[PDB]
């Protein structure tokens, strides 16, 4: 069993809902890692222990270059610790903050890496349901890695009804609390592709009520600089009917993607 004494601790890397994520190093191997801390009292008050249970059992199962590794876990009197792969280049969120918008090459490359990661997830009947920029991390070579599986589920036989995720990235069936499946991640992929190119997600409004309505009615428009190929991909992903959204194979082979991705 791991314990805190197995690790050297460094600076906070980021801030989570239930605690910070810290730079860490395994003492024997000097291997650099991240330690995600969750305070037990806060978890218990919020009553979301099942999210942590799902996060651990699902993410420790996954082995893919574009999915953040979870190596192990432990706890003490007051805290739960998740031992994670360290992502040195930070979040896609921060990168978008600094660049305002991504060019088509960078965007298509990220979408390729996301589609590969999601293809692997969906083959194991895992749905992520929260793939927003602050949960997309960057490896040492700037490769995208999906992280934060606290909203994920293993759904091999039945559809889900949980109210989950983050409004701006959610499809109509999820915000309306209807039955949903792996196609929710395809909708979020469309939101991301738009946000990467434009700098803001497509259904952004000043009020949550208005954003909710815009999502439900698929109300968004394209700025003039978004190209024909990008419009085609995004419009196909942001379909109200989940079954009309493309397979991930279709995303990976889309002409705008293959023309622009460096991967």
């Amino acid at each position: 069993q791991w314990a805190l004494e197995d690790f050297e601790i460094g600076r906070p890397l980021g801030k989570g809902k239930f605690g910070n994520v810290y730079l860490a190093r395994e003492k024997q191997s000097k291997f650099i890692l991240a330690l995600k801390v969750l305070f037990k009292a806060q978890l218990e008050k919020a009553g979301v222990e099942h999210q942590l249970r799902r996060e651990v059992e699902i993410q420790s199962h996954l082995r893919h270059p574009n999915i953040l590794r979870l190596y192990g876990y432990f706890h003490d009197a007051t805290r739960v610790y998740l031992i994670l792969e360290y992502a040195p280049l930070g979040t896609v969120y921060r990168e978008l903050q600094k660049l305002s918008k991504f060019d088509e090459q960078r965007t298509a490359t990220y979408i390729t890496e996301l589609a590969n990661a999601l293809s692997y997830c969906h083959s194991k009947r895992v749905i992520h349901r929260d793939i927003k920029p602050e949960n997309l991390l960057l490896g040492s070579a700037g490769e995208l890695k999906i992280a934060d599986f606290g909203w994920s589920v293993h759904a091999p036989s039945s559809r889900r009804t949980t109210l989950a995720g983050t409004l701006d990235y959610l499809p109509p069936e999820m915000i309306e609390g209807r039955m949903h499946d792996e196609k929710v991640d395809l909708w979020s992929l469309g939101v991301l592709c738009y946000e990467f190119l434009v700098g803001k997600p497509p259904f952004e409004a000043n009020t949550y009520q208005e954003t909710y309505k815009r999502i439900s009615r698929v109300e968004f428009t394209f700025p003039d600089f978004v190209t024909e190929g990008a419009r085609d991909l995004i419009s196909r992903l942001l379909k109200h009917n989940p079954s009309q959204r493309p397979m991930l194979r279709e995303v990976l082979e889309h002409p705008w993607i293959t023309a622009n991705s460096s991967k």
Binding site: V48, H154, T162, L163, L167
Partner: peptide, 29 residues
Amino acid sequence: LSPSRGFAEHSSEPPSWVTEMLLENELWG
């Protein structure tokens, strides 16, 4: 991996967007 058991949705904290929508509803309709 086992199929993910559901939970008691109203026994715990909802996503923050739900809480914000409820506030908007209570604050100005």
